[PDB]
Symmetry: C2
Subunit: 148 residues, 2 copies
Amino acid sequence: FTRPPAPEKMRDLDFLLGDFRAEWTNFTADPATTGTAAWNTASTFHGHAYEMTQRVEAHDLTGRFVVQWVESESSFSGYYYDDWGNRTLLTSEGWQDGYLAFTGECFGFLLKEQYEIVDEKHYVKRGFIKFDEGDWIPADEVHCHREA
Amino acid sequence: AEQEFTRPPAPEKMRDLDFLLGDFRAEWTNFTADPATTGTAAWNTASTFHGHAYEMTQRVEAHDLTGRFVVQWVESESSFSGYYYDDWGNRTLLTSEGWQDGYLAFTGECFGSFLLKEQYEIVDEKHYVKRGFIKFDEGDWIPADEVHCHREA
């Protein structure tokens, strides 16, 4: 055989590609704290996986978010892990009603990572958590502005 | 030195995976091909993210394939997690309870139906073996491949 081309569904993730300056607000702190980070996403493995590197020079944290389309499951997979020991597997049914939401169970609840496109150089990520049944509690907000 | 910080150190369970670390010449045999096929690859495993994840690169230049195997310890599940993906669209999620009876078995469902087992054993300080198996329904494990990795760095 020949190398299978990356799935057409990866178009749904093209908005992530490039180097971004990330301005974040952390709502889990009271009062809410703010800072900056670099969120740089590249295409890897011939387009079969998009790999975001998150560098928060402030908390000396480096994280990775690997995102793929899983045809057998008809959903996107998102695998996050960092050098503070955090690790989460999220899944997303895809874009619906202006949002791209990654959800999974976690141990620190339900976690939701909701992406939104603003324009050609700006996207937003909003993180939420949910206990028991209850409602979504905002956890952070990250405004990403493209540099390259 | 003992300078430290507030980021947590990597789990001590990652010591169970230190045998993978470094650059290895991999001699593989594929039992699912008929007749069985053989070749050589490079399996290079690095410590990444301050020890919290080990990242094995599998380069099979003869098949123009590059794969990645990311392994972590998941304390909440008392298990290792293994995330495999490559530039051919394959992707599998595997888990392991750790060393048992001289083998380290990562098992999971399917690939990119069946169950899959990736089983590691140590031969000596520069030589480990990986044996891949597949199981259909509730039968036995069927040998799928065998890889001898010899450390060059």
